[PDB]
Amino acid sequence: MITVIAIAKDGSIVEPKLDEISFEDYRLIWIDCYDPKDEELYKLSKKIGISVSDLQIGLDEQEIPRVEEDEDFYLIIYKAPLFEEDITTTSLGIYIKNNLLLTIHSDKIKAIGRLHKLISTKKPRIVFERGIGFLLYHILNEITRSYSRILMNLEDELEELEDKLLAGYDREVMEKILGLRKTLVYFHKSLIANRDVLVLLKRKYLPITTKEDRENFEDLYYDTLQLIDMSATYREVLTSMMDITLSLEN
Amino acid sequence: MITVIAIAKDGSIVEPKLDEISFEDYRLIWIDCYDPKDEELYKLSKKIGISVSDLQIGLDEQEIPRVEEDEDFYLIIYKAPLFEEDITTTSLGIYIKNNLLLTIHSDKIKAIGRLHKLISTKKPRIVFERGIGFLLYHILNEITRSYSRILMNLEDELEELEDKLLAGYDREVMEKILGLRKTLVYFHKSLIANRDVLVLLKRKYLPITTKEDRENFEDLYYDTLQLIDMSATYREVLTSMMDITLSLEN
Ligand SMILES: [Mg+2]
Ligand SMILES: [Mg+2]
Ligand SMILES: [Mg+2]
Numbered sequence: 001m002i003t004v005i006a007i008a009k010d011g012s013i014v015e016p017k018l019d020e021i022s023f024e025d026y027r028l029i030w031i032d033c034y035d036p037k038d039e040e041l042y043k044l045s046k047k048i049g050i051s052v053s054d055l056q057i058g059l060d061e062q063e064i065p066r067v068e069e070d071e072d073f074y075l076i077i078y079k080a081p082l083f084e085e086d087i088t089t090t091s092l093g094i095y096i097k098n099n100l101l102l103t104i105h106s107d108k109i110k111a112i113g114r115l116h117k118l119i120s121t122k123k124p125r126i127v128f129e130r131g132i133g134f135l136l137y138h139i140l141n142e143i144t145r146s147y148s149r150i151l152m153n154l155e156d157e158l159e160e161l162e163d164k165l166l167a168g169y170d171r172e173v174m175e176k177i178l179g180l181r182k183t184l185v186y187f188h189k190s191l192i193a194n195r196d197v198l199v200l201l202k203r204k205y206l207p208i209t210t211k212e213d214r215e216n217f218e219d220l221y222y223d224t225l226q227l228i229d230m231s232a233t234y235r236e237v238l239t240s241m242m243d244i245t246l247s248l249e250n
Numbered sequence: 251m252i253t254v255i256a257i258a259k260d261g262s263i264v265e266p267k268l269d270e271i272s273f274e275d276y277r278l279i280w281i282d283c284y285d286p287k288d289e290e291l292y293k294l295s296k297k298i299g300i301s302v303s304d305l306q307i308g309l310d311e312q313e314i315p316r317v318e319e320d321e322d323f324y325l326i327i328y329k330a331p332l333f334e335e336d337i338t339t340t341s342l343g344i345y346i347k348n349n350l351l352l353t354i355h356s357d358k359i360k361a362i363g364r365l366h367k368l369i370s371t372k373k374p375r376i377v378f379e380r381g382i383g384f385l386l387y388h389i390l391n392e393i394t395r396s397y398s399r400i401l402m403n404l405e406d407e408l409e410e411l412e413d414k415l416l417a418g419y420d421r422e423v424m425e426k427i428l429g430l431r432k433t434l435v436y437f438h439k440s441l442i443a444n445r446d447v448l449v450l451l452k453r454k455y456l457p458i459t460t461k462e463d464r465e466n467f468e469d470l471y472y473d474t475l476q477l478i479d480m481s482a483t484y485r486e487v488l489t490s491m492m493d494i495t496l497s498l499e500n
Contacts, residue, residue: 114402121483145402152399229371 005040008032008116014124020047028132029100032112036104048102050095058093058104065091065193067200073097074208076136078197079190080109080143081150087183089190092143094136096208101135111142133206133213140198140220147191147227151234154180158237165241168248177245181238188231195224254358256284257294258366262381264374269293278349278381282366285309285356298347308343308354315341315443317450323347324458326386328447329440330359331396337433339440344386346458351385361392383456383463390448391470397437398473401480404430408487415491419498427492431485438481445474 009018011026023029033044036059045052049072057063058075061082068075074096082090092105092112103112115138128134157180164173201209202217209217259268261279268281283294286309288302295302300323307313307325311332318325324346332340342355342362353362365388378385407430414423451459452467459467 121479149399149402153403233371 003037004034005037006032006034007036007040007044008034010119013129023100026099027129028135030103030135031100032103032116033105034108034112035106044102048095048097048100050097050102055093055095055104058091058095058102059106061090061092061106063091063093065190065197067197070207074206076197076201078140078143079194080105080111081146081187082107083110086179087150087186089186092139094139096132096136099132101132101139103139109143109146111139111146114142115139130210130212133209133216136208137213137216137220140194140201141216143194144220144223144227147187148223150183151187151227151230154183154234155230158234158241161241165244168245170245170248174242174245174250177238177242181235181242184231184235184238188228188235191224191227191231195221195228198224253285253287255286255290256282257286257290258282258284258362260366260369262375262378264369264378269297271297273349276349277379278351278385280365280385281350281352282362283308283352283354284358284362286354298345298350298352300345300347300352305343305345305354308345308352309356311340311342311356313341313343315440315447317447317454324456326447326451328390328393329444330355330361330393331400331437331440332357333360336429337400338436344389346382346386349382351382351389353389359393360396361389364392365389380462383459384466386451386458387463387466387470390444390451390467394444394470394473394477397441397477400433401437401477401484404433404484405480408484408491411491415494415498419495419500424492424495424500427488427495431488431492434481434485434488438478438485441474441478441481445471445478448474 007019008031009021010016010030011018011023011028013027016026031044031048036044041052041055044050045055054071054075058077063077065077065079076094076096078092078094079089080092082088090105090107090109092103092109095102095104103109105112161173161176164170167173198217198221202214202221257268259266259271259279259281261271261276263276271279273279281294281298283291286294291305292302295305301321304321304323307327313327315327315329326344327341328344329339329341332338340355340357340359342353342359345352345354355362407426411423411426414420448467448471452464452471
């Protein structure tokens with residue numbers, strides 16, 4: 001059971017990377033902590049003044065998306081897609097403590113690795129000095145893009161499947177239909193939960209959020225809403241096709 | 251071997267029936283003409299009063315994206331992803347005459363469905379009044395999003411390809427490699443040609459675009475550059491894997 005315990009750190013102007021650190025030298029900080037060994041986990045607690053119990057939360061990929069508010073910090077449970085023999089969702093914890101943003105998760109969140117890969121491929125130029133409603137914002141924006149993307153390929157799958165119905169009565173069809181129903185269930189439930197996290201973020205006045213960031217989450221809120229309607233529409237599609245392979249046999 | 255010839259007719263506030271319509275009954279009208287039988291096309295020129303020749307620009311899918319200036323109208327050629335067993339890109343003309351945005355394409359364009367479908371579900375009236383410096387960008391955006399969807403997707407095939415080389419040579423892999431090169435080559439060329447179109451729209455003051463459209467095309471310009479970068483990044487990766495497939499055997 002390879003457990004990576006990968007941690008990815010960032011900072012002020014511009015283009016930093018580090019581990020055992022000050023972060024008073026930095027405008028903001030993104031520590032992406034990926035699925036830590038029990039030893040590197042405390043390594044983090046020591047560091048950021050965020051306790052492991054408080055942290056162990058954002059590590060439970062079954063945690064319901066939400067926002068918990070300041071003790072020393074802010075917690076946002078968010079849902080990201082989880083890609084496996086069947087696609088699913090999974091929960092990233094995100095803790096914002098003053099100038100530090102942490103992502104903490106059990107499964108890799110492709111949205112994160114993209115920024116990371118991008119971020120390491122990205123020049124000194126791009127301005128995050130707006131950040132940490134901003135950073136958080138992109139993190140959700142990206143995860144969203146993940147959803148948006150999967151839904152786009154799913155609508156792709158629905159199209160092939162529709163002509164594959166000309167075969168009918170098919171063992172494989174019902175099995176793939178449902179598999180797709182499954183993902184669609186995970187999403188709809190998650191984008192709605194995430195929608196409910198977005199709801200607060202586009203509205204609630206927060207130290208972490210500025211108006212400009214608050215502007216974003218309304219976009220992201222309505223985008224997510226886009227994704228929720230679709231999840232449901234693809235669902236409607238699925239049951240209808242489910243109606244066909246039933247009439248064809250079972 | 252049909253010519254699918256689907257005339258979609260949309261106008262504010264939100265409804266159908268071309269080949270009787272009175273302009274200036276609406277803010278704007280969106281006519282999408284997909285792969286018309288020239289019976290249906292001639293009718294279209296007649297109604298919109300663009301030279302039947304000038305519309306034929308639009309149906310040429312080899313056309314290099316660009317912006318061309320008035321003969322009684324505006325014209326944008328743009329490269330959008332094209333789907334098959336293997337993916338490439340295909341040109342659509344977009345003509346803007348007064349309040350009429352006409353999107354004309356010989357090949358299906360994934361993005362235009364996604365607006366025609368969105369619109370179907372999308373609510374009516376107030377306010378699309380932002381329309382048609384806006385309407386243009388959205389199509390352009392949805393297209394760009396077509397590309398972005400497939401890159402992040404193609405990226406998957408790359409990760410999945412890295413393993414297949416543990417299986418070593420795989421003339422299969424090599425062809426799959428040449429396949430994803432083929433796709434990428436079209437994207438890169440296309441995103442280049444799109445890019446400039448957007449640099450034009452992002453800069454040049456135009457009757458069809460407003461100040462806000464141009465900022466909106468600037469965003470679109472940015473991601474286009476990302477996509478080119480990814481496309482760049484990805485061909486890179488496929489040059490290596492190929493070199494690899496080759497150090498196996500051949
Ligand atoms: Mg078929
Ligand atoms: Mg691997
Ligand atoms: Mg494998």
